[PDB]
Amino acid sequence: MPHRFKVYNYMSPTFCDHCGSLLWGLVKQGLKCEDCGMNVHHKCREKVANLC
Ligand SMILES: CCCCCCC(=O)OC[C@H](COP(=O)(O)OCC[N+](C)(C)C)OC(=O)CCCCCC
Ligand SMILES: CCCCCCC(=O)OC[C@H](COP(=O)(O)OCC[N+](C)(C)C)OC(=O)CCCCCC
Ligand SMILES: CCCCCCC(=O)OC[C@H](COP(=O)(O)OCC[N+](C)(C)C)OC(=O)CCCCCC
Ligand SMILES: [Zn+2]
Ligand SMILES: [Zn+2]
């Protein structure tokens, strides 16, 4: 099933579940899936399989 990613403000350092690199920045550092909690870079979103 597709994910439902929504922009998220990460309060502690957090790494992208797709590529492994840090979700760097002060705010809105990436996207969190509302249904499974996966965290991704904005630009990793299209690389993620529809396996929510
Ligand atoms: C030496 C690190 C160089 C890269 C800088 C990345 C960074 O600063 O944020 C990654 C936070 C920072 O850890 P913190 O210093 O904020 O404390 C959390 C550590 N622990 C989870 C064990 C309680 O670390 C983690 O939570 C887990 C990943 C640690 C290895 C990543 C290189
Ligand atoms: C905090 C100390 C740890 C240093 C960071 C370690 C690290 O993970 O570096 C790698 C990620 C790369 O993330 P990027 O935001 O460049 O994009 C990765 C996703 N995609 C390639 C698909 C677009 O890039 C960064 O995070 C570095 C900061 C980039 C700009 C800061 C002025
Ligand atoms: C004096 C103003 C400094 C200029 C920096 C721009 C800024 O205000 O912060 C913006 C970024 C978002 O990243 P940026 O908009 O700087 O670049 C995009 C990075 N990526 C395409 C990989 C997502 O949002 C953040 O939270 C990071 C804080 C700044 C780090 C970037 C150098
Ligand atoms: Zn999901
Ligand atoms: Zn990523």
Numbering used by the authors: 229 to 280
What did the paper state?
Diacylglycerol (DAG) is a versatile lipid whose 1,2-sn-stereoisomer serves both as second messenger in signal transduction pathways that control vital cellular processes, and as metabolic precursor for downstream signaling lipids such as phosphatidic acid. Effector proteins translocate to available DAG pools in the membranes by using conserved homology 1 (C1) domains as DAG-sensing modules. PKCs define a central DAG-sensing node in intracellular phosphoinositide signaling pathways that regulate cell growth, differentiation, apoptosis, and motility. Herein, we report the high-resolution crystal structures of a C1 domain (C1B from PKCδ) complexed to DAG and to each of four potent PKC agonists that produce different biological readouts and that command intense therapeutic interest.
AJH-836 is a high-affinity synthetic DAG lactone with considerable promise as an isoenzyme-specific PKC agonist. The DHPC-protein interactions involve hydrogen bonds, both direct and water-mediated, as well as hydrophobic contacts. The structure of the AJH-836, where one protein chain has a bound ligand and the other ligand-free chain interacts peripherally with DHPC, highlights the versatility of interactions that Trp252 at the “DAG-toggling” position can form with lipids. In e, one protein chain is ligand-free (color-coded green) and has three DHPC molecules, labeled 1 through 3 that cap the membrane-binding loop region. f The versatility of potential Trp252-lipid interactions, exemplified by the Trp252 sidechain from the ligand-free C1Bδ monomer (e green). In addition to non-polar contacts with the hydrophobic lipid moieties, the Trp sidechains can engage in H-bonding, cation–π, and CH–π interactions. The structures reveal that all four ligands bind to the same C1Bδ site as DAG. AJH-836 is the only ligand of the four with no additional ligand-protein hydrogen bonds compared to DAG. In the lactone complex, a combination of the E isomer and its “sn-1” binding mode affords a favorable arrangement of bulky R1 and R2 groups within the hydrophobic rim of C1Bδ. This configuration likely constitutes the structural basis for why AJH-836 displays its marked selectivity for novel versus conventional PKC isoforms.
